[PDB]
Nucleic acid binder design. Structure first.
Lengths: 107, 246, 72, 144, 90
RNA sequence: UUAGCCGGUCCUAAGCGACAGCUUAACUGCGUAUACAGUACCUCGUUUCGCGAAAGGGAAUCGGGUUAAUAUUCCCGAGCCAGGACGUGGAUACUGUACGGUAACGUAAGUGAACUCCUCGACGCAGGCAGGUGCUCCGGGAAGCGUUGUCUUUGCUUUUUAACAGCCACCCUGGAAUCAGUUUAGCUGGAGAUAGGGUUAGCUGGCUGGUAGAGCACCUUGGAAGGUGUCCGGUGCGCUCCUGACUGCCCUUGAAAAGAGGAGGGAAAGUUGUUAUUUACACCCCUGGCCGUACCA
RNA sequence: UAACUUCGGGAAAAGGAUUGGCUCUGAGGGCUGGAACAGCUAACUCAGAACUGGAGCGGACAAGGGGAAUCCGACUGUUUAAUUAAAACAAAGC
RNA sequence: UUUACUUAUUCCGUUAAGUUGAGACUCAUGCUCUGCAUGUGUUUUGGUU
């Protein structure tokens, strides 16, 4: 039976005006404006989503503690970790091959 | 009276190009010191469908020479070019696919795409999907160079002008038929509104020079001079020759 | 809103000087009871099941603290 | 001959000490706890920051100071390196008895600050070798 | 069961457009919906993202190619001839 | 016709006004051209101002009550956000910014200037599949109600729980063909599968707080006072909206900017005490302007 | 279930038979304790038989008339707001 | 009538960053230690600067 009305100013079916049927202590059925579903931080250059760090809309990322917005590593906030191993194994070897030449360039 | 839709097209307004979701004007990297006294290592980060053209665009990430920051140019992608590949722009780069040599360095018989007419032109010739301009032969100095265009014609061009080695991607995208009017509609929606064209014979004698009459015919020669004014020049303009070729 | 789970914390939140009142709720099922301290940001509350412990606890609340309210 | 040994510099690949140079001290293949081949790294969490001739002398003393770390790492995570640290600081002397038990790890680090400071400065090797390439590797931050 | 005689992938387009045009489509539609072998990983999991763009599903790499196949034959000829022109120059 | 939280206000879209100038007798028309932080001393410096969305983007609110006519705006209660902050008590360092786990990552806290890179904001359509909110439905228990010439352990109504707050793909071992795992559909695997043990994401999931004092359904004394009850389970290719991962389609590949955050970098400070980092470590404190808000549709 | 066909269609081509009520029978799941058994139990979906009726039964509502040929346009799409929806416009192909 | 100059005039590009003519720094085809030069130097990996 019981049918409901939008409570906010926007009376259209957009993304922002997404709604959720609740029933109350009144036994009265009624909307709540829940927003859009936040995308959780896909981070580069893989573009996989990061473990450790939750989906929130980006202003509420302020509220959280600094701990919660990262992973405790090198490049933790924005890196795949697996991607990070690439960075080190590059920068180890590309220094070592560059160094081995510059000792051979003494002759 | 009344102005023909040939004439209304220059006025702008409703016949302008639909540019909105197009992803930047595609160009070569603007002629530096680094490019003309050696070379500069690019890295291809992305490959993109730009709407309203057949070619892909490669998005390429160079290091800046003077500041700390990191620049990003968008080229028209030569085919055989992948995400992770180093491109090497400049004078003393190898003749391999991707790379952007000056034309005088390229040994003749080379296929080139996205070629500069002048020096520092940023790249005008042979940009459409599948096309290329082939090098014919150089000067004695290396100052000027012959090129053969996708038309047929032969063009003298300065040797310090440059372009990408290899063919532009999206090759052979006219060999299909669009079966539907719908497939024509979706093509010309993300370009200008040039479609559907109405035949001028269907129109009344106000609106077009052909239109009118109790039978649906043209009534004077379809062939028209170069010297004719705005709104005469319809049908076969300045035509040397007519009818089926051979 | 918030709960308390032990008697260490409940003695602190009562003694803390911005705590206004202690409404105390009792209900028959058997006699399970709730204390609720209205402090300044949050309403802290502390469930006790045994009545004889809860009678002892009402003495342990301070007299210089102002209010108490009861249903019944 | 296993690459890992009790006197070999590595680079750590995973965990919160990733891209941090450090010396292996002693090696294992499992126990009751841990069903894998681990090793006791004794590394460098903050390397000494770079220095001028035209700084004041007290600032040069500070900038050279090191934050060490101690950790059992899994063998897969560590990466071996050409260099090796066996003939300069002598890595067995550097506490075998005290590890996780008794939480003497804090005690262990203060041992390493005494060593790694005296090694980085006055790092010339005894008798013959003038600089040693091994030791000047650990001083550099592995810039990613 | 094989459930048509001839028309195959282009039963789709039904009883219209005309059989010559329908056959031109059939042969290059058969090309573009194919998987192709990746250069870089090996696995035959390459799909056409957009005209002129191909993605190796397993690999994750994207590369440029033909409209309707990974390697247009004209472009295969240029990869041969530029490798030759580089060698003779030395 | 009562607002920090409902909107406008702020941002930029298609576009539109003006700056430098350039045209024209002006009216007009064009308009991205330009010299536009550490009293005094340096060292940096490429974008020009504004308008343009009450369906796009975006700080934060929910329950019950109330008036002849207003309510997420009044009242009672429970919260949250932006800006700025005292105080008591905790963490950390004092030759220099916390620890733990093999790892994925973690916990009451856990400094980070210039400059740079990255993420969110940020995005198509169709298809089925799984899960969830609300609705509809079946049965037991407790209230009141209806029918009763006849039958009917019977038919109907009520049995509710808000925002807010706490707790419940990836790594290690290992080494796969007699190939194995797996979906409705296909896919996945020596660029490391099955399996065993972990880590992490989540919804509109569960439990407690909020919270029965409220709301609802009944009963008895006044001529408004006081009571009981509000319990326990199912069902589905169901209908609704939402999420999730997939599959397909394109000569169609599906906005921007404000704003919030991360990282690389290591500039600064701090010498065992009035220190100094914490202004979202916990608690505590202060302020929130302007306009719309009746009613028809 | 035909001519014809661009082999995709034509096609619901054409042409027939059955259907209600009542009483039964068979087939199709899930969860527990270890040759497959023993307990507890939940869907609306098909197939078939008997009996019964003024031969009725998609009982109201809802819901294609069909076939053989010719002319034009291939098709979907568009159009003279208030006398013209077509054989006109467009269309892919050339 | 033909073809030299560059400052009028014209067109393009740049965040107006490396132009003109001399010079050496490294190894290198290699000749003579220092020579005219012909000459190049980042190109081995989705690091960093």
């Amino acid at each position: 039976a019981p049918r409901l009305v939008y409570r906010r100013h926007n009376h259209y079916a957009t993304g922002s005006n997404r709604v959720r049927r609740v029933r109350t202590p009144g036994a009265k059925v009624v909307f709540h404006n829940v927003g859009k579903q936040p995308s959780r931080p896909k981070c580069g250059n893989c573009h996989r989503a990061l473990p450790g760090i939750p989906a929130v809309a980006p202003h509420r990322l302020r509220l959280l503690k600094k701990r919660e917005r990262t992973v405790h590593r090198a490049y933790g906030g924005s890196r795949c970790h697996a991607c990070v191993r690439e960075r080190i194994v590059r920068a180890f070897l590309v220094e070592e091959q560059k160094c081995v030449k510059q000792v051979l360039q003494v002759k | 009276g009344r102005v023909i839709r040939a004439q209304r097209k220059g006025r702008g307004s409703v016949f302008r190009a639909h540019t909105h979701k197009r992803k930047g004007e595609a160009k070569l990297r603007p002629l530096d010191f680094a490019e003309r006294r050696g070379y500069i290592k690019g890295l291809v980060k992305d490959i993109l469908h730009d709407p309203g053209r057949g070619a892909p665009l490669a998005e390429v990430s160079f290091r800046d020479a003077y500041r700390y920051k990191l620049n990003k140019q968008r080229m028209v992608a030569v085919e055989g070019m992948y995400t992770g590949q180093f491109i090497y722009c400049g004078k003393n780069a190898a003749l391999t696919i991707g790379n952007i040599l000056p034309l005088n360095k390229m040994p003749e018989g080379t296929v080139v795409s996205n070629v500069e007419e002048k020096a520092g032109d940023r790249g005008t010739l042979a940009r459409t999907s599948g096309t290329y301009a082939t090098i014919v032969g150089h000067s004695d100095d290396g100052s000027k160079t012959r090129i053969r265009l996708p038309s047929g014609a032969r063009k003298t061009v300065s040797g310090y002008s440059r372009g990408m080695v290899g063919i532009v991607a999206g090759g052979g995208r006219i060999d299909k038929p669009m079966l539907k009017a719908g497939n024509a509609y979706h093509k010309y929606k993300v370009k200008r509104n040039c479609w559907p064209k109405v035949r001028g014979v269907a129109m009344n004698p106000v609106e077009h020079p052909h239109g009118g009459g109790n039978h649906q015919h043209i009534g004077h020669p379809s062939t028209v001079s170069r010297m004719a004014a705005p709104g005469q020049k319809v049908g076969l303009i300045a035509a040397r020759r007519t009818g089926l070729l051979r | 809103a918030k709960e308390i789970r032990d008697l260490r914390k409940f003695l602190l939140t009562a003694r803390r000087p911005d705590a206004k009142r202690v409404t105390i709720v009792r209900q028959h099922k058997s006699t399970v009871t709730k204390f609720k301290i209205r402090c300044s940001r949050y309403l802290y509350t502390f469930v006790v099941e045994d009545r004889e412990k809860a009678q002892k606890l009402e003495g342990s609340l301070p007299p210089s603290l102002e209010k108490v309210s009861i249903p019944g | 001959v296993k690459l890992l040994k009790s006197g070999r510099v590595v680079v750590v690949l995973n965990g919160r000490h990733a891209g941090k140079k450090g010396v292996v001290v002693n090696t294992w293949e499992g126990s009751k706890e841990r069903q894998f081949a681990f090793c006791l790294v004794a590394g460098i969490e903050k390397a000494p920051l770079k220095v001028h001739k035209k700084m004041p002398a007290k600032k040069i003393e500070k900038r050279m100071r090191v934050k060490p770390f101690l950790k059992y790492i899994n063998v897969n995570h560590l990466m071996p390196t050409r260099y090796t640290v066996s003939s300069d600081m002598d890595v067995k002397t550097m506490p075998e008895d005290a590890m996780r038990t008794v939480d003497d790890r804090k005690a262990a680090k203060k041992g390493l600050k005494k060593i790694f400071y005296e090694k980085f400065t006055n790092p010339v090797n005894e008798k013959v070798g003038k600089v040693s390439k091994d030791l000047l590797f650990l001083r550099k931050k592995l810039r990613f | 069961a094989k459930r048509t005689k001839k028309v195959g992938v282009v039963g789709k387009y039904g009883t219209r457009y005309g059989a010559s045009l329908r056959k031109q489509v059939k042969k290059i539609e058969l090309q573009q919906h194919a998987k192709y072998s990746c250069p870089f990983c090996g696995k035959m999991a390459t799909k056409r993202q957009a005209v002129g763009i191909w993605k190796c599903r397993g690999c994750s790499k994207v590369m440029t190619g033909g409209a309707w196949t990974l390697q247009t034959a004209a472009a295969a000829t240029v990869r041969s001839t530029v490798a030759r022109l580089r060698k003779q120059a030395g």
